[PDB]
Design a binder for this molecule. Structure first.
Ligand code: PLP
Ligand code: PLP
Ligand code: ZN
Ligand code: ZN
Lengths: 408, 409
């Protein structure tokens, strides 16, 4: 479709027919947005937010040019808010105000673009090593920045296989190593074992001064910190940088995120942001929610998302449907709906014969129960022909599959 | 400064002390934004917009993942609006629906990043040639993308010196040419002569298919089209791509822009956007304003911005102050205020001993008059010790300078 942009009539100042046409379009649009929001499950966006308190600020063009810390003569900005937000993220990952540098990004890809660019200026001859299941932005960065990339193999879970990382590293002891570590993969919600990655690096003869790690924690990077007894991402380990998405867990009307690296790394980048003009509203949104919820509030919500993910998985198994849920994940991978109009209604994310539900704060038991009824109901129709579902052990592991051959 | 993020008390659910604290902070903030907006002149942002009509849409997380044209399973998006906006920009630069590809960017730098990346995948061995006064994003892109860059010299106006481009091109006939053409330079509001650039290229033996041009029209790229008798940027010339900023002329609460290239070029890129998640509100804002104003409305406002720029220049000269205003520009370059707290109050953009006022739609004669009074008043104070204002001819040309030595040229 398209909604054309047509010239107003010569009469328009008298008749107001444009504003009237547009009002209906927007009304119609809004209605469809409301229902799409209601019935969304597939993507890692928290749809539950109230920024009514920021209502009176929405009409200014707030723009944080360049560095959050350097001042600029453009006065319509929100740097004090940005800095407060950054400080909070620094404290979260155990780096002191004076050691870190960071900024609020447009999105998850920008974070990956920034961290990887940093890695490259650290080690201009570095190879980029990354899981095959790391996000496409990682590989795009390699192409954009003209870097050799070595795609590491993956376990069933979607984790990086650190044994294949050994092979790769050893074969390239010649040159330094730039790593992309996934804190929650797009597809299976896998968490690369940071510690085993660091371990592998050292015992392949890469000392700290000869590698750089970016942690892409878009989704789960903000959730893991609040999981008790979970390997921490922290600048107390040889971590270069961490990206995380605002529009994912926090819930924002605009996409945004937070890139945090070390001060030392940013001087060796000698304006250190990928983008120039930066949406000064994003800092306000993040400032308001962090202030409102705290470590405490985030803890509650993470625990709930895990509980509800575990609920969804259990309930799928009981219904006969094979499903999987990694540790350190709110994302449930189950067998793809057959009629993929059901996929579009529920805005599910699909690949091969698998689909996933990312359980965010906005995803509620009521809404899961609604999904489950409508799934079971449409399952009967899809498979009334005596036809059976696909076997799923290829995708998810035999220990997780329920097909006739497995019930394992 | 900073506004700390502090944990709520254990009591907070009962007392609501956080929401109360924050309300004052936001109130205080808003008040300062109101006055900063009122008295802003230096930067190329139109501050005059009413998107009250879009008020009821502000609470959804609208996200146009990847390609405007490809569908995605995420249903909270605004692709139909984006496409409508793109079509409008395609028509503006004389390229048909089926020939062009484009998207709505986060900003001007993103457009430069995209167009230059396109140039590179066209000519992996290309040299990037760009004016010295092209925006720093152009040079960042070269570094990011590991490209040889040849900084071309500039005339006094701020235009690319096409004679120095000859020299540079001829010295590198071996390899193809990727050009960045400025439709309105950050500092002097110069317009690179696109035609003379194309001309120079051809008569240095670069046929089409051995060069790529990106037009960075961040500011003026949207204004020039509505200037009568102005060299057109159009896909009817050997143009690769054109970037333009929403938050500049149109006026937006969030930064955004429009990158438009050719379909052919994007297949040779084979997801073709720099960024992944894309703010789906930006398309709505652009859709609403384009629909509301049209070619007609844009014409009015451009003509007004020129008139008012010319007003400001005239008035500066009368007051004794040396100033310059290129044709094809709403940006007035005059002698930098001495006490640069006056600079911060008026949010002026400064470099060496020069400063500029970018006359956008929101910049009004009343507001210019206010600026001029307050300038003249503070000038007397700055210079009542027999100390003199700077000479400016280095920066702007002797034909534009009024200092004692130059009144007589
Ligand atoms: C979707 C995704 C991204 C990309 O982030 P955007 O906000 O879409 O730019 C990065 N990392 C992961 C793990 C993702 O799932
Ligand atoms: C400021 C500017 C840009 C950069 O655009 P952003 O919106 O700040 O990313 C590009 N080109 C010109 C001519 C500029 O003046
Ligand atoms: Zn099986
Ligand atoms: Zn002079």
């Amino acid at each position: 479709t398209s909604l054309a942009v047509t010239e107003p009539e010569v009469n328009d100042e008298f008749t107001g027919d444009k504003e009237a046409y547009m009002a209906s379009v927007l009304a119609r649009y809004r209605k469809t947005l409301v229902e799409r929001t209601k019935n969304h499950l597939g993507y890692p966006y928290n749809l539950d937010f109230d920024y009514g308190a920021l209502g009176q600020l929405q009409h200014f063009s707030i723009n944080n040019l360049g560095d959050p810390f350097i001042e600029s003569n453009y006065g319509v900005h929100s740097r004090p808010f940005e800095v407060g937000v950054l400080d909070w993220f620094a404290r979260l990952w155990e780096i002191e105000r004076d050691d870190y540098w960071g900024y609020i990004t447009n999105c998850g890809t920008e974070g990956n673009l920034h961290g990887i660019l940093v890695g490259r200026e650290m080690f201009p001859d570095g190879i980029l090593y990354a899981s095959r299941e790391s996000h496409y932005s990682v590989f795009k960065a390699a192409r954009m920045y003209r870097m050799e990339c070595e795609k590491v193999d993956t376990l069933m879970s979607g984790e990086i296989d650190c044994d294949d990382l050994r092979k790769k590293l050893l074969a390239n002891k010649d040159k330094p190593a730039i790593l992309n570590v996934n804190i929650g993969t797009t597809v299976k919600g896998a968490v690369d074992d940071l510690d085993l990655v660091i371990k592998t690096l050292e015992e392949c003869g890469f000392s700290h001064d000869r590698f750089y790690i970016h942690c892409d924690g878009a989704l789960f990077g903000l959730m893991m910190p609040f999981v008790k007894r979970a390997p921490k991402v922290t600048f107390n380990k040889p971590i270069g940088s961490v990206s995380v998405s605002g529009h994912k867990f926090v819930g924002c009307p605009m996409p945004c995120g937070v890139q945090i690296t070390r001060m030392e790394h940013i001087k060796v980048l000698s304006d250190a942001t990928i983008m120039g003009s930066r949406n000064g509203h994003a800092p306000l949104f993040l400032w308001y929610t962090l202030n409102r919820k705290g470590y405490k509030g985030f803890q509650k919500e993470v625990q709930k998302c895990l509980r509800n993910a575990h609920y969804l998985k259990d309930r799928l198994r009981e219904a006969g449907i094979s499903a999987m849920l990694n540790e350190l994940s709110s994302t449930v991978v189950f067998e793809r709906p057959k009629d993929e109009e059901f996929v579009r209604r529920w805005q599910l994310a699909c690949q091969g014969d698998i689909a996933h539900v990312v359980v965010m704060p906005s995803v509620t038991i009521e809404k899961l129960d609604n999904f489950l009824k409508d799934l079971v109901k449409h399952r009967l129709i899809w498979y009334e022909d005596g036809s059976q579902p696909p076997c799923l052990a290829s995708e998810v592991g035999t220990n997780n599959c329920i097909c006739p051959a497995h019930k394992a």
